[PDB]
């Protein structure tokens, strides 16, 4: 019965980055609830992603649940152009209070990749409003910020595969990717690069976009807190916007609330999504300093150009109100902490396996980097018999977990993790 | 109170197209039934504009509302990747079922835009595939696609003040706007433009894009289904893929269930959102021919890259069938007949206002185009006193009701934008 389901997605339904030709195969998930999603023949998974970073209350949550149905009570949706609404404006109001001070303008939007491209468009326009065409982006190599073609164009131009698009995309600049490790030493040496581009650049420069700290989906990388101190130091001296994206590290994914804090620095621009609506519906926000706001509104456009049909969707900004109000109790910090405890010392013994190059931990991130890239059909079977659900990626076995999983749950998980690594056929060589 | 909260909405929260130096008033609006916003201070406003094209169920719409909560009771999210669900499996078998007969590839992304800038990849990965680089979109003038930027440089270059955006964003191509009128016979000179511009880059075009019939916030403009006719042979001759743009006009606005049907035509990539979830939150999809998929797939990358983090939301996906069941009912066919009619008659007075240069209806589309830019704070001022929600845009006034309207509550609307037209206080010389 469910069969027939599989087989009408197999033939007609594309999932992130797949093949029409020769898609690989997907579970059916019924319902989730707790740190478990549950496939359509009962089996219960124990859930290492919460659905890519942002489902940090888990699933099936009573207050997010609550909230979201409030909501729709009200209006589900309303239109933002000429109307505002009580959702929009509380959303609006916790992110200015939680942000590092000078951001305080919020835009709306309603994916990451528009969050991205809204902040590229606010440097953008900022720079036309002081009267210098700067169109250039300074980045991170292992850099992603999403699917989109602005989001792309500052995306590593080796993993997005920019080859194929290097004619459509323009040409940003990429320093390398940063060296010094978040338990590492820095040094110095890093520097290198970036501060070269910087001054044989600094004039076309609209901004530096780089997630801080923590490099997601671009390698799960997480590099020292000197870099932003840094680029935050560089952007002033140039008086370049810095546009810290925050998509994947916010919401104290990082054991910070902001993966920004671990340098005590602001961004101009910072983009948010992802665990903003707890992970139940799309959202984004990207929020700027009241200057970047001025001066792009006191541009020749007038405005700032850009305005989603959904944007300010209630129901999204009232998830994630719901979602903002459980970390105000604070818990997820130890949570945070506690999980990350736990992941240093259940993945450690992965140093040891021959299929493992490096394992990483920071707040609830757990990467273990492998030599040799991950078999993805055959590693993803496994881990679902083992009761798990843990996504690879590449050379990455990674957990980010809910906050809320219990430390048996996590267990499960970090043997799932060991056991995998510690065998070769699950790997491509 | 709820004078602070405009406060800060005023002073902090970005709206579309909006100036946080001097942003204009908006109304706060707690709730919304039937065709009715609720303000603050409890009067009703008459809902011209159902959201901008997408609610056209109207708020609070029981089905959609017991779709939306019992999906939540499920999960309202989980991961797309290597796993799918039924309210995605559902909403894809639906589309593709009532989508033109080549279309079987559906592609879930979460707004408009995404979904046009995933059309374009679409068209370049193809291309790519099959060795042949072709990079350049051929667009028409007045067209709109969204304000990423992929999605702006197909979007027209005046109206989007391209001035600003001429160097970040690739040059397209732009035909003139399709002059032939949907209740006008066709006018075979209107081609010229068109046919000089494709036959002068035919080699280099990876697609042509376009909104079927209407152009609608590119100046709510109403052509000649033999547009489509023509543009589809012409694309069929030089291999060009034809994307349809079907975000605004989809799911029976303008009299059919997609705009593409006033020609026969069918288009290679199909891009769908706003009506798609009943306007309850965003949505999109953009479906593509099994040639186009396989094409792409077979291609370098050995995937369609592109993957947005909440990919196939359950929740969107679950409202999203809600209002597609409703139109199952066949009840709108009449109901966008009638509105029709409806429009056509009670519009046709403001033809004689001074103020007023065009007037045009189509489905549930009404539109009085005037002769110079509306003054939109009091004209917005003067239709929420009147209790009637119409936003009307540069220099249009127009209409596009919730399907199910009644006709005391068009006639306010339609008396509104009557009275509005006669008045000059109310524009901009
Ligand atoms: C930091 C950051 N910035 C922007 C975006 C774009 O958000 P969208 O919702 O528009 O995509 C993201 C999103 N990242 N998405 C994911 O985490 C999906 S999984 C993924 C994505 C890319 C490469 C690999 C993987 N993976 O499976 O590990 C963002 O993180
Ligand atoms: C036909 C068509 N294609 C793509 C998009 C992009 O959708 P997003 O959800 O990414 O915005 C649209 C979007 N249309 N949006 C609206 O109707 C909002 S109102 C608007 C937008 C642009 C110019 C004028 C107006 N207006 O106030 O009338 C789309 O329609
Ligand atoms: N791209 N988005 C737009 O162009 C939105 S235009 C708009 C919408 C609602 C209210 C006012 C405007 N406007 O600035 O004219
Ligand atoms: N935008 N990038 C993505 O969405 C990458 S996700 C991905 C990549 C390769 C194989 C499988 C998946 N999923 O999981």
Redesign the interface.
Same mark, same amino acid.
């Given at each position: 019965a469910t069969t027939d389901?599989?087989a009408?997605?197999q033939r007609?339904?594309?999932?992130?980055?797949?093949? =029409?030709? #020769?898609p690989?195969?997907?579970?059916?998930?019924?319902?989730? /609830?707790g740190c478990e999603?549950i496939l359509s023949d009962g089996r219960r998974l124990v859930d290492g992603?919460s659905?890519?970073?942002?489902?940090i209350h888990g699933?099936?949550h009573p207050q997010?649940?609550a909230a979201?149905?409030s909501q729709?009570?009200?209006?589900?949706?309303?239109?933002?152009?000429?109307?505002?609404?009580?959702p929009?404006?509380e959303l609006?109001?916790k992110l200015?209070a939680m942000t590092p001070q000078p951001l305080?303008?919020?835009?709306?939007?309603?994916?990451? #990749?528009?969050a991205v /491209?809204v902040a590229?468009?606010m440097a953008?326009?900022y720079w036309?409003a002081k009267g210098e065409?700067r169109?250039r982006f300074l980045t991170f190599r292992n850099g992603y910020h999403?699917?989109?073609?602005?989001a792309m164009?500052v995306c590593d131009p080796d993993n997005?595969?920019h080859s194929?698009?290097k004619?459509?995309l323009?040409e940003n600049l990429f320093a390398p990717a940063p060296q010094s490790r978040m338990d590492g030493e820095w040094d110095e040496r890093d520097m290198v690069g970036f501060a070269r581009l910087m001054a044989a650049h600094r004039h076309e420069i609209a901004a530096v976009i780089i997630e801080p700290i923590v490099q997601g989906a671009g390698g799960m990388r997480m590099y020292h807190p000197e870099w932003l101190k840094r680029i935050r130091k560089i952007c002033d001296r140039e008086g370049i916007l810095l546009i810290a994206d925050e998509i994947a590290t916010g919401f104290g994914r990082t054991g910070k609330l902001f993966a920004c804090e671990h340098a005590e620095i602001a961004p101009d621009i910072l983009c948010l999504?992802?665990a903003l609506t707890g992970?139940? =519906?799309?959202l984004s926000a990207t929020l700027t300093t009241?200057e970047v706001?001025?001066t792009? #509104?006191?541009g /020749?456009?007038?405005?700032?150009?850009?305005?989603?049909?959904?944007?300010?969707?209630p129901?999204?900004c009232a998830?994630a109100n719901a979602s903002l109000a459980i970390l105000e109790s604070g818990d997820w910090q130890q949570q945070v902490a506690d999980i990350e405890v736990q992941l240093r010392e259940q993945l450690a013994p992965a140093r040891d396996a021959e299929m493992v190059a490096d394992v990483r931990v920071l707040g609830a991130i757990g990467v273990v980097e492998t030599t040799h890239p991950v078999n993805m059909a055959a590693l993803?079977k496994f881990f679902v018999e083992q009761g798990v659900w843990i996504?690879p990626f590449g050379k990455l076995i990674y957990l980010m977990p809910p906050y809320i999983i219990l430390p048996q749950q996590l267990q499960r998980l970090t043997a799932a993790v060991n056991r995998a690594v510690q065998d070769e056929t699950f790997f491509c060589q």
């Open positions: 389901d599989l009408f997605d007609h339904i594309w999932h992130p980055y797949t093949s =029409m030709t #020769s690989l195969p997907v579970y059916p998930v019924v319902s989730a /609830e999603l992603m659905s890519w970073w942002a489902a699933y099936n997010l649940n979201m149905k729709i009570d009200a209006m589900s949706h309303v239109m933002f152009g000429g109307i505002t609404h009580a929009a404006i609006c109001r200015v305080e303008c919020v835009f709306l939007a309603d994916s990451g #990749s528009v /491209e590229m468009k953008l326009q036309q065409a169109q999403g699917d989109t073609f602005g164009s997005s595969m194929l698009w004619g459509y323009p999504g992802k992970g139940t =519906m799309t009241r706001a001025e792009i #509104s006191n /020749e456009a007038g405005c700032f150009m850009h305005g989603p049909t959904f944007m300010g969707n129901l999204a998830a993803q996504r």
